[PDB]
């Protein structure tokens, strides 16, 4: 024995964060490290992943990777990048932190809508947007919705709820690429160069751990919504003790990335995603929470030469939700993007989220968010004073 299997991923990042911070590799240098991982939470997550006691998987090769963050300090309390993957070699690639996969629509809240309300492009969640034939700015390439259809004049909250692409890209045009990119920096996310395609895709040209999105980064980002607009750099360690006796404490300093009002508005709209939208498989009548779903697609080449079914398919299915205490981003798909997620497999990400959040909150007495000063309700929407 050396270390349990369920901590492989977590321990991998600890080694790295200590390395980045102090500059020493604890595998060749004696140190005592106190981490933020919630052992019991980890264990439970592992069972959700590797057992059939919580979620019905279509098979054992389907993958999952998620990260749970404490929205009050950015501490990563649980993380796991793969399931039923026992190719024992320690600290292999941890998918929870890799930004090689597309997070689709989970990018809409932080890349289009948050910035819009933040910068005054929209004054309320009732604002009327446009889901009509529309081409990517500066091109004749059309922006398609999954059903290749259009709802026309719908409200901001409804556009998000049903995850309509047109309104999202259009919104990104009104917000402006440069400040949309600056707004993501406030949430830890960045691209080499941002493009309109990023209004609904995290797909980027350069492949680094920094560019794009990963469960790790998405959770930290959404944590900002939950706590009122403050972004905390994800942390795996909070203290290390060198063999000499001197110690190092790591601070959870948070930076405001959006107004208190913007956060409440985004949150308000995102809970309707779980109630009447795409994220209905993660809904809990007793838990005040909000989230967003995402589905990536296959290229034409892929659909014709590699996809052998007429069933709705995708290489990636994602969910990123949060309660008032915890933020969790989930990723699902196969190591080989060419193996699609089908029917039952697509509900996996949401259900994995629901199971974990149940575990983390059913015991406590969860509180809701309170309408901050500067906004007022009016039936189903929220407006600025």
């Amino acid at each position: 024995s050396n270390y349990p299997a369920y901590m492989d991923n977590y321990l991998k990042e600890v080694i790295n964060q200590v390395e980045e911070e102090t500059g020493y590799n604890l595998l060749t240098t004696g140190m005592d490290v106190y981490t933020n991982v919630d052992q019991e939470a980890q264990k439970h997550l592992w069972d959700i992943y590797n057992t059939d006691e919580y979620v019905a998987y279509p098979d054992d090769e389907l993958q999952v990777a998620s990260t749970i963050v404490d929205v009050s300090n950015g501490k990563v309390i649980a993380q796991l990048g793969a399931r039923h993957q026992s190719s024992n070699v320690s600290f292999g690639i941890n998918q929870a932190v890799e930004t090689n996969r597309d997070w689709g629509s989970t990018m809409k809240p932080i890349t289009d809508y948050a910035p819009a309300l933040e910068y005054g492009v929209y004054e309320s969640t009732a604002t009327i947007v446009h889901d009509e034939p529309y081409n990517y700015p500066g091109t004749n390439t059309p922006v398609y919705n999954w059903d290749r259809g259009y709802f026309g004049n719908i409200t901001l909250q409804y556009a998000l709820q049903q995850s309509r692409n047109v309104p999202a890209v259009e919104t990104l045009n009104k917000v402006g690429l440069n400040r949309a990119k600056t707004f993501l920096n406030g949430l830890g996310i960045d691209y080499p160069s941002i493009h309109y395609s990023n209004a609904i895709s995290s797909n980027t040209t350069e492949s680094d751990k920094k560019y794009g999105a990963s469960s790790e980064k998405m959770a930290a980002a959404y944590a900002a919504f939950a706590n009122g607009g403050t972004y905390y750099k994800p942390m795996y360690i909070h203290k290390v003790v060198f063999s000499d006796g001197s110690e190092k404490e790591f601070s959870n300093v948070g930076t405001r990335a959006m107004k208190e009002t913007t956060a409440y508005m985004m949150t308000d709209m995102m809970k309707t995603v779980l109630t009447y939208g795409t994220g209905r498989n993660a809904y809990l009548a007793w838990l005040p929470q909000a989230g967003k779903t995402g589905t990536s697609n296959y290229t034409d080449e892929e659909i014709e030469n590699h996809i052998k079914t007429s069933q709705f398919v995708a290489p990636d299915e994602l969910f990123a939700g949060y309660t008032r205490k915890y933020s969790m981003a989930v990723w699902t798909g196969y190591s080989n993007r060419l193996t699609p997620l089908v029917g039952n497999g697509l509900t996996v990400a949401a259900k994995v989220y629901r199971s974990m959040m149940t575990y983390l909150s059913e015991g406590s007495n969860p509180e809701d968010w309170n309408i901050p000063e500067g906004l007022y309700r009016n039936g189903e929407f929220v407006f600025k004073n």
Binding site: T29, V33, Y34
Partner: peptide, 16 residues
Amino acid sequence: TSSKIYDNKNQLIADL
């Protein structure tokens, strides 16, 4: 070289 690692409840979880 040996490095002990603890969780958030400050209880040992690994030694490397």
